[PDB]
Amino acid sequence: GAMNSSNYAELFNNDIKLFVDDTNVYRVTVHKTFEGNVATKAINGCIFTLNPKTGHLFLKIIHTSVWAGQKRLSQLAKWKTAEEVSALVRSLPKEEQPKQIIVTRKAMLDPLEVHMLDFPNIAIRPTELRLPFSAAMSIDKLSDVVMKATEPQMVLFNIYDDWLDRISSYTAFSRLTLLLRALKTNEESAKMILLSDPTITIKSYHLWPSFTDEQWITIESQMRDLILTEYGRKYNV
Amino acid sequence: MNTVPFTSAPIEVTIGIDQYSFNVKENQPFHGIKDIPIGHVHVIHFQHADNSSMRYGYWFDCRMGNFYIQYDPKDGLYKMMEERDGAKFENIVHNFKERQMMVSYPKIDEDDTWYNLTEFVQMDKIRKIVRKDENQFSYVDSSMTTVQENELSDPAHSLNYTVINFKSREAIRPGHEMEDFLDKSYYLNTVMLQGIFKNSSNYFGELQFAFLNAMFFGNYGSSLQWHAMIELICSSATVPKHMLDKLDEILYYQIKTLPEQYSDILLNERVWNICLYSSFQKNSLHNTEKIMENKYPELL
Numbered sequence: 001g002a003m004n005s006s007n008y009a010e011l012f013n014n015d016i017k018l019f020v021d022d023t024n025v026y027r028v029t030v031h032k033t034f035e036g037n038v039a040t041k042a043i044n045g046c047i048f049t050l051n052p053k054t055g056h057l058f059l060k061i062i063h064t065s066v067w068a069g070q071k072r073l074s075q076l077a078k079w080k081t082a083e084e085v086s087a088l089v090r091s092l093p094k095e096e097q098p099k100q101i102i103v104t105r106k107a108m109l110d111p112l113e114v115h116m117l118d119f120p121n122i123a124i125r126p127t128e129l130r131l132p133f134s135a136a137m138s139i140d141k142l143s144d145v146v147m148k149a150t151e152p153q154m155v156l157f158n159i160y161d162d163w164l165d166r167i168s169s170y171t172a173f174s175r176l177t178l179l180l181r182a183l184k185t186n187e188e189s190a191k192m193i194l195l196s197d198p199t200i201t202i203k204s205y206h207l208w209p210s211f212t213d214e215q216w217i218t219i220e221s222q223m224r225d226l227i228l229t230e231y232g233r234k235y236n237v
Numbered sequence: 238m239n240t241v242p243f244t245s246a247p248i249e250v251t252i253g254i255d256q257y258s259f260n261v262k263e264n265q266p267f268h269g270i271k272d273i274p275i276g277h278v279h280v281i282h283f284q285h286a287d288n289s290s291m292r293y294g295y296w297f298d299c300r301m302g303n304f305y306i307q308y309d310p311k312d313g314l315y316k317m318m319e320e321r322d323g324a325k326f327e328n329i330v331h332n333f334k335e336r337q338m339m340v341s342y343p344k345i346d347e348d349d350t351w352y353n354l355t356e357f358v359q360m361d362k363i364r365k366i367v368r369k370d371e372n373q374f375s376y377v378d379s380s381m382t383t384v385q386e387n388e389l390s391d392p393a394h395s396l397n398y399t400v401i402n403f404k405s406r407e408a409i410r411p412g413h414e415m416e417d418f419l420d421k422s423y424y425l426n427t428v429m430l431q432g433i434f435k436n437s438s439n440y441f442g443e444l445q446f447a448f449l450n451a452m453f454f455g456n457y458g459s460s461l462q463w464h465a466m467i468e469l470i471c472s473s474a475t476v477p478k479h480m481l482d483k484l485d486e487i488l489y490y491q492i493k494t495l496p497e498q499y500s501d502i503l504l505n506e507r508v509w510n511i512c513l514y515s516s517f518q519k520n521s522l523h524n525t526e527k528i529m530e531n532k533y534p535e536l537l
């Protein structure tokens with residue numbers, strides 16, 4: 001069935017599963033035509049497909065050329081996402097294919113179901129959680145590689161850097177969702193917190209800074225404050 | 238005109254023949270139904286006074302033999318049987334007619350309702366949906382499940398309607414995933430019409446039969462099948478012009494014949510709103526839309 005606060009720990013068991021988010025697949029800047037009408041111009045997007053246990057991120061880059069001459073793009077994007085997730089599964093060895101795919105948006109259920117007909121034993125599931133994966137394009141290295149792509153391209157990352165050496169998956173996912181939720185609510189502030197101390201760097205092969213365990217607690221606390229804070233500047237509390 | 242005589246009526250029962258019905262009291266002198274229009278299938282059906290559970294009945298064609306009804310006190314129902322002794326039968330009938338103990342199939346001459354509801358329904362196709370080849374007639378009741386319902390238990394007692402499933406490989410061409418899901422024309426025209434049903438007439442016959450089993454027996458699987466066969470046409474961008482016009486006539490007479498106080502259970506909101514207002518054929522069903530709007534604007 002659906003994934004929610006009540007079955008949250010199933011994410012970190014030993015059944016392979018993937019989250020699929022499509023909110024950065026079709027991206028537009030809206031603008032005005034010389035005639036004073038409005039047009040969209042597409043920019044490169046990405047499918048955010050993530051193993052929450054291992055941190056492996058399959059970042060499928062969606063080049064604006066995909067959309068050329070197509071109609072009803074917002075609808076097409078859901079079907080392109082489903083086509084690319086299905087191709088990814090067929091590319092994986094059998095022992096690496098997921099048992100479940102959790103879509104972050106319910107509109108992906110039928111598109112993905114139909115593309116995965118060849119995989120009747122892979123459960124396609126929605127979720128009641130409001131996951132912050134839309135903020136993935138606030139991670140500088142992921143944004144950079146998407147905008148620079150000149151062709152369709154798949155790039156592989158570990159979104160947990162080296163965290164699993166010191167913490168569990170449950171803890172790593174919680175950290176990830178805290179960071180992403182903070183970048184989503186106030187990107188400017190979130191990014192100030194991460195880069196405040198010039199002495200803490202981001203390794204060439206990592207996405208996030210190299211915080212000690214003590215500094216990660218300080219960071220995490222600063223992110224929580226922000227997420228509440230911005231909950232007061234919005235709701236006035 | 239043909240006749241279906243009854244040996245007796247030992248238990249109080251409401252007897253229907255096609256869209257007509259009458260109440261028979263316990264041991265009331267009752268011996269049959271006469272003046273049955275030849276050239277159409279017919280359905281005789283029964284609802285006992287004491288256990289309105291199980292509506293049941295028999296699909297038959299008077300051209301395929303002489304049929305009669307006799308109550309079975311062991312199995313507890315009115316059973317249809319065939320009489321092979323032709324003279325025995327005519328004699329039975331003529332004597333019962335002489336005693337005026339038969340109800341006259343009460344057809345208004347103006348009225349084409351039954352023809353319109355059974356236009357494409359053939360006994361030969363019914364007998365393939367209801368498998369019991371030792372009898373020329375077909376038993377159906379409220380509780381029988383469909384082959385598809387079974388998939389998701391007694392198969393000899395199943396309704397073997399054509400399986401329709403919009404998220405299936407039969408329905409979706411490899412590599413046309415989105416195209417075929419949003420426009421079902423491939424599944425309608427190539428898979429079903431050309432491949433399985435062979436022509437639109439056999440398609441419509443199964444659609445009409447499913448509706449009639451839903452209406453007369455409250456068969457849930459039949460209602461599901463009726464709605465699925467409608468949705469597949471309405472969700473196809475490309476439908477022969479002759480099918481579209483005929484479908485409008487078909488559905489018109491089905492909604493027309495439906496009981497006003499059953500539209501809650503026998504009609505599927507989603508299918509009808511989509512079919513009449515959102516689908517490819519939203520504008521191709523004028524007569525059906527018109528009678529749905531004037532009669533069931535609560536569903537929409």
Ligand SMILES: NCc1cccnc1N1CCCC1
Nearest residue numbers: 266267268269337338339340
């Ligand atoms: N032919 C009508 C009829 C049908 C069946 C049983 N009794 C009947 N009637 C009751 C008294 C008049 C005749």
